[PDB]
Design a protein around this ligand. Sequence first.
Ligand code: YNT
Ligand code: NAG
Length: 536
Amino acid sequence: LLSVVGFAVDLANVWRFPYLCYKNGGGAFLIPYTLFLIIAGMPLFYMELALGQYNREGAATVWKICPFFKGVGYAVILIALYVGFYYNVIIAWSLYYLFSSFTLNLPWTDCGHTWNSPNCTDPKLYSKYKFTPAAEFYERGVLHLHESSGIHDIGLPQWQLLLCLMVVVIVLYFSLWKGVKVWITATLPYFVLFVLLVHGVTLPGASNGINAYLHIDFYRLKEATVWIDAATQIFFSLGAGFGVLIAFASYNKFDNNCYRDALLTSSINCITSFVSGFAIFSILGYMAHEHKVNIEDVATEGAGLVFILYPEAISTLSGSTFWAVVFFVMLLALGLDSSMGGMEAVITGLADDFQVLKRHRKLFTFGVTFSTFLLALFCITKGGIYVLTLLDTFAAGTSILFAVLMEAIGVSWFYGVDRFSNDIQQMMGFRPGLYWRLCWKFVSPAFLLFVVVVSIINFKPLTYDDYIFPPWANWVGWGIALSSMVLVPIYVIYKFLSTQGSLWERLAYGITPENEHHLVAQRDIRQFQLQHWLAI
Ligand SMILES: C[C@@H]1NC(C)(C)CO[C@@]1(O)c1cccc(Cl)c1
Ligand SMILES: *[C@@H]1O[C@H](CO)[C@@H](O)[C@H](O)[C@H]1NC(C)=O
């Protein structure tokens, strides 16, 4: 009713999906997206919920079921800590836009302002990009991009965005320092999306936007970037791979039916994503028709697409100020909820792992939030959109795909998928069934390993709209990705080193659950008997 409704919608759903869908064509992004959501996203969501709910442990410490894999929990915690660096900058932007949308005549409509350049063009009077009043506001008035030569020269933070990020981090801390623990913040995004869909589809030229959306081109599906984008967006929206589902479900009741939650969340995700893309392309069609430019080159396909679209739509509704205020309140509340969820994943994992941390949640919360603030200072610089692009590309990229692949492999092969299904039948009365066992053991790891190998061997040098990141920027992005990814083999080669006993003793102790470590002394384990692995 409300739980799955608010739960489903996320900032990653109304901010990242729009420009990922624009950049990857129109509906050509919804075929890979839906494919993964059906095959490798819904089973992974259900698996994460079941894991967290049965084991009662956070992202990091849920690996008492197969010790060698605690590195996977550490990797997901690191991925979350990374994403939290640039996920607070989006909320800083939302806060700045809510602050600047409190005037009658909004700023992003005309360009007789002070941040406008002598190149601006107002449609109410051939790189049409970044010359429209709203694009010049976002770039020149908020980010101050015009003061950064690139990712090599990023000036000092913008005191406006500095204050906004500071307030956001203060809100996060003060809402996250006491324990882990309304309906309007879960109903609003859907209502704003409904208003946008209706009005947009009423807009002139939105017919061309909807046609470009519905016109599926397959030469683009044949490429490797659309599938990587779809997979990363599915794991970025539904949560599988951030240690957030496990941490949140550990507090769910035991008899809680996580299968219902998985089904409803996937359904709502698919539906709302189709609708959001529909509305976004209606707004793109209107922008392209009013600005006299093609739909494929009317706006930025980067991290600031929605901050140019949604002002463009706001400014075409009656009483557009009320709409600006309400839409940016919605965006800010969604951002705060999602960032609090990610920070809670991190804190709950690292506290469930280290009791010394769980004793002091004030100090640990302060540490985590102060770290995220100091590291977002980089993204809120004058060339901070470049660092934000770097992080968005590499923070949760092949890193998240690899983490989720290793988690699925662990649970489905080393901990057994028949064992997992027996746990399910224990906490829910019904066995998951053939479809889910098959998507956990074979189909999900297959798809995810293919997408990982592709994202590695089909990686396109990082670039902003018309800016080619220098080579070392890609080097640093891959350093980030690997730092996130290299924790699994490190922790395995560690476990195998800090367990006294024969080679097979050490390969069992790290592969058996932590409670049934008295069954290993006999040299009798399931993983060793070569029948476990035939558990389809
Ligand atoms: C973007 C993510 N979408 C989820 C649904 C998985 C909820 O968590 C997130 O909001 C998140 C994850 C990790 C760190 C941070 Cl700061 C935020
Ligand atoms: C647009 O930009 C140029 C250089 O970027 C600047 O001299 C002026 O504002 C405009 N010039 C032309 C030819 O449009």
